[model samples]
Target: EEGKLVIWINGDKGYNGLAEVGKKFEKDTGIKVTVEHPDKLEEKFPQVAATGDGPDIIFWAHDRFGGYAQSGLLAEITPDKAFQDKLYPFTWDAVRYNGKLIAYPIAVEALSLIYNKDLLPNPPKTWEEIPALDKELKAKGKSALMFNLQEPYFTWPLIAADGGYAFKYENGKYDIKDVGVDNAGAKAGLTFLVDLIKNKHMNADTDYSIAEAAFNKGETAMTINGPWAWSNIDTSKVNYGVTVLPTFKGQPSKPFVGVLSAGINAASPNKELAKEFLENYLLTDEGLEAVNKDKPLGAVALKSYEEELAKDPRIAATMENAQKGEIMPNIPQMSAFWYAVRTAVINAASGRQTVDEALAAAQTNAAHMGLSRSERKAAERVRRLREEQQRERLRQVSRILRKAAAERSAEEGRLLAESADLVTEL
Candidate 1:
């Protein structure tokens, strides 16, 4: 009746869910609610936020708005303190930046390994075991793994499991000066990828669309994907199993946990009312149940919803995987880190450069993107020092060995000389 609340969402599915909730809110509070679903979310979001004509609320991933949040485009809300106790620790931690809460999470998703139970009775437990499994699958003319080489998000889990971090945080800011895309862990991870291609375990022809189709058609035995694929996968036709990406040297495979949440626009005319609506209508038990009915991927609250989602074994497994996953950094510079890491990984996988060379290039690119010149120089200096220390240790060991050998030779010579004198006297 007073002022209408405008909302922007991603697509028809997103629109449907928001509309259902908005109607319920409107009926209860008599506050007018308008929902808009734009096909081009990326293009529309920035344009709206830039002009200060954005919706009162938006449904998007934290990663998409990291830069906006840093630039003051998004509003900061201090939600009712009571709702704080209802959320998972990781979920709550994800929405806060510099001690300010920016969004109210709706669902969480992370990567895990999905396998066809009929093809492989037992899934491999580690990266090293994958090669053997691949050979076994190849002998039977079956695909061992499916992936989309063109998309970086798809490969993020493997990179993480290899201990490759996208950005390092220091001094209340993200430091990309030491991009570890080509570090030992990354090299080891991508080397496994290269071997997959060389061993005929996977192919470049499989894009996202095709990979999902192949899995549905029973042509693929295993893949690394997130919970989003659960609804599309036809479990009725094929027996399957799901689990976290197995360990590497006993370290659990750390997948990137992506969160989709609701945030209030800073320029909203009704800021106070909007905050109340979010806390009461979206963050409550009744509210979360409504939101999760259609999007049941991860925990909406502290308790595990895995049992309710067990029908889709893959999604259930992903929820379990989230326990050990890393919530990808939502810092503004994350955009640069994503591009740089993707480029480096592709180059290394395609043989354009050695993994080390690719990683170094990425680190330089990332440092140039946002890091200060002094920081970049310091990072390079530290790397050189580590190399020098290794060399000096080796040199010292060589010297010790040489000195011991000379002393032993002299002793042998003196003994021979004394023996010669004794023989002459005889």
Candidate 2:
């Protein structure tokens, strides 16, 4: 048990590179390392880890880092220069929470504009060209753009292209207090979607399934999606091209880059062993290759692996857009954001609510529920410190009272002894 290490990764999330990698780690270090892929990891991980029964390391996306770290479920590790210099510099942004590196970033994924090359020879590079393109496509019984407009993840790029952002990012930290859901730029971005849908350029009720099916059937010229969508599209026999999202008013489209990363469980007894396994066994070229061998990591964070991975035009095109994308804010308040923004975008796009009304309500709703886990932890810590100080002061007062009581008893004993001596003399 002393030499054993346990890890939890989502089942079938990637190739079985870890099976071979874990075997090697065990053989070399004599540490019996086991990998478990459990169902409902998000729901179960925190609950088990809170009781100190969780695995030594957890494999998950960096988006959950803020919650785990603030809740004391993750341990921060210091990576030497050799380890730090290997990955893409931008990849670090995904794993850091409040400027502390909380996870080891492995790969990156972001939304890119995927178009049917057969339908449109050249992807439109600007917003002005879409109307004309839409008119031309309409004559052929097709729409120019179709995506899951109700889902914020698929629609965020359009909103973010002009300046819409979930939170204020400065230097390396996210200001969770400064949510930008209702800013003028956000309004403009939402308006871009409303115009396209209301004017019949795009579908209003298209979800991921509907959008993907339509694209595969060549019913739409373009859809904005991430790397995961390609496998299905590739099988559909549509000659597709992936590229950066079209620009709006000279501003580039900004999508959320989700980083799949690994973090150490704070309560794990084998912290050093876990860190060693990650740094020496898993993060190396041989280790990365083994994992990518079975199923290729779409955007491996290691620069050395990029040359070969980039040979695929889809990965190359995704990397181009990924360079401009923002790391999805890894904060607990993001949950509130998803719910509020999804409702607002869906309602507004469906013409059930005005853009201003929907967005304003979204901003208000998120604000009402927006205190981040880190902020809650900070407040709890303050209360704990205050309570500890009060208890310490009470202990000091009790000690003084005890000392006085001992002194009073000692004086009374001395008086009784003198009275007995006088009685003996009488």
Candidate 3:
């Protein structure tokens, strides 16, 4: 009998899809596969790799795989040229880091505005329009939007729609210094939330279950969420529609694409066998169909899946509006940004700070984790110097104007000019 192959997988919907594929693989190849769901697999992957006792293959998201690849815990599989063209270009691109294809993607999740058509009737076309709709809904005692305030993933697509980004890439790597959370577009997006809060249209305290309940009860008209919510949505009563999130000033909302992939562990003794399993089983048409049939979240392949997805009104509307969707940053620093953005959004919504203030705070916190102490001090000094210079310049200008006014008053015959001496004394 062939040696057993061990694979660690996530416990979410993604795992369910992979489990089906695992069954098929065992039946077809007579390979014994052990699936393990370790808690916080990203944190545990490095230890597993260090000991060389990790599974031969791991089913995980492309985002988590980025850190492992950078740490040399993942095997570079781009040399396996046959599997290259079998994937969607965008999906393939997400798992590629530093020119190495670290994982093979099973599916892609894009952002779309899922609304109960019975309540919303028509979704807004721009961020500005949301407030008006919110007002109308509030007057009638209804929720305009529903979302999990605790999850930063929920805020990213909305932030992207306003042209805000958590981080920017440069020179083949992510540059933490280029965070745009405080940019004009980001502030505008934040301001939209403030408006929602002010108008009693949105609540900052709603958690995942509460928000879902609100939507299911028809108390909330729309929410920015993903396909995972399909299992929970009450489809029987409301006519639901999904569309690309509305933009601000023609800027489309860019949702983070969550991509799950099959990755090979570099330290596994069965490297060749693991690579074969990944290439032959995960990337094959049978595997793609099996995963798609089992999960049915997004398109398995780019071509006819759209037509098939359109058969369902919800998925059809989402795909139709995903033109501006972007693959979420799979960079290792993404975890920091995720937390920071959520904090900023909550601060903004709760009126703890202005949009600019919240964004600036979040940006600073996100970038701080990546910067050296010396670099951070230098940045702080520069900011302080600029602020001090502006204050000093304004003081000098005021003094000059006062001196000039006194001189002019002495030369003029007006009584107001005579009062300059008293003004000077005061």
Candidate 4:
């Protein structure tokens, strides 16, 4: 039988605060516990159990769930309905992958537009307004909104708004075989991004740090970032406001929204104990409070903590933004996407490939590699067969319908040709 539960935490204030909650859990359950902050957790996690011992529980983001869970590193958790009902729908959805709860949802981080209150009187609702706004800001020697264009986390929203996604999310699950990185909307989104790069006269060379630093010094009017950026910035100066990303690609730009969760190691003998600690302590009001003790920006879904969490205006605002955001897909195919899209995005920004071709190449380059050669082959075969059918349907309309047009022959033929061209481009 296991004697104690060991949890690996990689947060600063959150780690310290959760350690206190662990003490309380220990007192109530008569079970000893240890909180360890191992060096290089992200790079080292996959190797720990293979090499030797590992923690019973670990704290991290939900996006990593697919990688961990696929390797059988994370234990599947089934929280009681009472416990389940307390969480917000989106946060709850975020912790699940392959239809299983991989972690206990705790806090969320999401992207939104943060602007200097003194510079922008109102948040612009449409991407169409940005060019004029940029010109307006230029008169005062201020630049327009800027973000790390090459980063996928912030940039994915541009594609997501127009039914463009890395993978198709449907029926409470993700369909990895259906990638939309090169879909009509995805192409439109990438095209829109390149245009923004041109119209706003934005710099592609500047990354997140430069953008954040520039915005902090009021050198820029606005930036696309999350609540975490607030820490480095002095709260006393540069009064700022956070709002949802504006419209782009025909709808509101929706950035990737995510949660930081704690999961039990599937291989650990102390799985039940780790679950107990997570469910009884971390999922409780006192536990959630401890987790958010120092960093008030981390939002929790527990009803008991709602009033308490709302006390922090910033956190309340973050939760509001999160409500308007979409869930980040947690699936193994993401490994393929991260590599392919990173290259494609850089290629798009560098003008090596047309934005249209870049996303299409990304879609084609994507594959499930966490599986074996045989499994990968099967995945590729299935993906190709399914996409061929979709493309065939698109072509049928263009070839047949264009010849059999009604009174509005010119309009129907033009639309069919445009749609076929879009599908052909993908």
Candidate 5:
């Protein structure tokens, strides 16, 4: 039987290009590389790999890499020093788990400030500048800057800018023992956003659809989104520009740098060929060309090859912003962390909890439900502190409620089922 390698390409824009790259590898190496388009790659990955039916190679984000690695489901690539030396340190960190390099970094993706250049002569460069700049937009009936308040992923940059982080990086490694989600910096950042909405400079309803529609329709001057959003905008109608994330409270708002990579299934027989496929083909000029053929958005893995692939101005801009941001942690603990953070941010925005209170609740929830003993202990030492706020939150809430009443006074209407356990009508 011919030596066959089953490869899985994600159902993303990069799919076709990666699949094409695998076919090229098959033609060149005679190692029948079969690229399969799989749904829910992360969910399907470990389950199938353990059963010994998984693909030899898989294209996915580094964020999920740590989870599979911890299960001993991924194989170490053991790339040569020369090959390893050629890649970005951020990409390397994305796949490196417990001193083992288990995957090949192929591209980059992260959030940045996507702005409508025509609306504002100069876009605000910092989050602090946002409210001040929003006054003119407010008068013009437009949003100063908009982002989905419910999504912690997009809001993460603001949290980091205010000095919050996932883990402590000491010397050269991420110390999982140091969790900073409920920290002072995070609260400060969360407060700024909460205040923005409370003050009416931004909308409380900036969900994905609303935010996306508003930006493209000229109702919003700017938004915080990733490279994927660029494809959605009808360039025919709007003049858009991409730039580094804005600052918050005079600090840089940094987004997570997510590296797209190819990981080897631990149980696959074609492990060596998979590594060759990644290091020799995926990291090469030919590979990147094919990957970017659809649209040159991928940040090629190797620094030496990046300049050539980044000829597209947009790719260059994404890469530029990526360099300014930090890599999202790819630890198994992130599963719980994401849930905690998202819920906390939502609770804070919904007026269910104060920013600090929401995060404190989130921290406790994740630590109990999301983290292992190892992770929980790391954060156990640092207790959450409070602002002697005393009455500030109430004052802010009162101000916003008054505005809501003055502006959107369907508030006078009563709920038919305002009684216990049944909110049937408003």
Candidate 6:
């Protein structure tokens, strides 16, 4: 039952790290693990996997795999809940797609509120406090907060603060058609931002480099950024502390969570062995630490390592912030979202259009992207039919909900029926 387990890892750090795991795996299991680092590995995966020729395991950021998993190029994994519980809660959602686990989560990255403690001793508990903070900063000839106003990615935390999301995530899947960029909550978020610009508290022209430079030069008291900017910010004389994004009207602000993962290829001849190495070796504390050494960022998935990794306070801060993180959309429709949101943001921030008008236009534009009206109607009709069939599955479980309900309790049956009515609306 032994086989040569081949893996595709991109970049030197990833490849070198996996190579370390490969050596120990080969020694213990007598199965040589091959780690391949080919150029354009991400682009080449689907093309090769379609022909039944691909590595047993592939390593990459989790966002790009949903399409591959939907295309059947990646295998669906069902690791035990006991093993899964060892990682941070959000990390699982990071690698999950369409209600199924598609990869082994290894690390996580997300934005946090990074501020200069010297400028503001205590961060405000809510967005309302930002105005006073801005007033205070201005007296010192510095800005309170500065982030890329034109970029949707950097501004997601604010947009999502009040019930806004790119796509509605329900029952463990993304509803791509239900675009939330222009919803009332999104408008509230954008309104807050526009007000800042209109009142001269923040610059409308702010972009990534500009914000980074301002924070680095201690010209801005606070910025929302990720760990990638840590070393640079440290190099500057700013005494910064990272924390969770402040709440908006009692609702926690959420950054888009990004995960790095290792996925098994569906076409692999050594599927079982590939899974074995992942579970038995790479997924363990030792395995995670080894690879993390070679990775540019710290490992974030494992709970066992949180305390040790927290030795670097920045890492600890981001990890805590990620508890409120939302999985970034990993679907192909993401391209449309980027364009729709970014364009809408610029129009509003530049005073060329009001927030309501820009976001209203963006909602319609993003929802209609890449599909004709007829095609969309037909797809929705088909989806409804599938839902109908899925509803016929009341007597089934594990088959339907990933667990057998044969011995399910009375309370369970009542809730199940309640949810069936909820599905009727779909």
- Indicate which candidate wins on lDDT: 2
Name the candidate that leads on TM-score.
Answer: 5
Per-residue lDDT of model 4, residues 180-246, tens digit only: 7777777777777777776655766768778878888898888887655665555537888777678
Where does candidate 6 clash, by residue pair? 398-403
User: How high is the CA lDDT of each candidate model?
Assistant: 0.68, 0.79, 0.69, 0.72, 0.74, 0.78
In model 3, the Cα lDDT at residue 229 comes to 64
Which regions of candidate 4 fall more than 4 Å away from where they truly are? 1-43, 50-54, 76-78, 170-173, 234-236, 307-324, 367-426
- Runs in model 2 deviating more than 4 A are 1-44, 53-56, 170-174, 269-273, 290-296, 310-312, 370-426
Clashing pairs in 3: 161-253
lDDT of 2 by residue, 1-426 (tens): 357888887663443667678889989988888888888675566666664567888887788777778778888688988889998787787787877899898878777889999999899998768988999999999988888876798888778888788887788666767888888888998888898888888767888888889999899999887766776676797999888789887988888778878899898878888888988888878887787665455688888876677898888878777778777778877767877889989999999999999999998887688465344545565577789987775554444444544565664545434555443443
Model 1 residue 382 CA deviation (Å) reads: 41
Across residues 206-310, which tens digit of lDDT does each residue of candidate 6 receive?
988899899889898899876656766767898988888899879988877778788988888777788789988887778877776665444467788766887
Candidate number with the higher lDDT (1 or 4): 4
lDDT of 3: 0.69
Q: Which residue runs of candidate 5 sit more than 4 Å off their true CA positions?
A: 1-13, 26-40, 138-141, 171-173, 200-210, 234-236, 295-298, 309-320, 369-426
lDDT of 6 at 179: 88
Model 1 spans > 4 angstroms off: 1-15, 29-44, 139-141, 169-176, 234-236, 270-273, 302-316, 351-354, 371-426
- Candidate 3 per-residue C-alpha lDDT over 165-222 given as tens digits, one digit per residue, 9 for 90 to 100: 8666777677767877778787876777677778777787877778778887788888
Predictions ranked by lDDT, top down? 2, 6, 5, 4, 3, 1
TM-score of each candidate structure, all chains considered together = 0.75, 0.74, 0.74, 0.74, 0.75, 0.66
* Candidate 5 per-residue C-alpha lDDT over 168-224 given as tens digits, one digit per residue, 9 for 90 to 100: 678987666567888888888889888998988866567877888888888899987
Steric clashes per prediction: 0, 0, 1, 0, 2, 1
Measured over all alpha carbons after superposition, the RMSD of each candidate to the real structure, in angstroms, is 23.6, 10.2, 20.8, 19.5, 18.6, 15.9
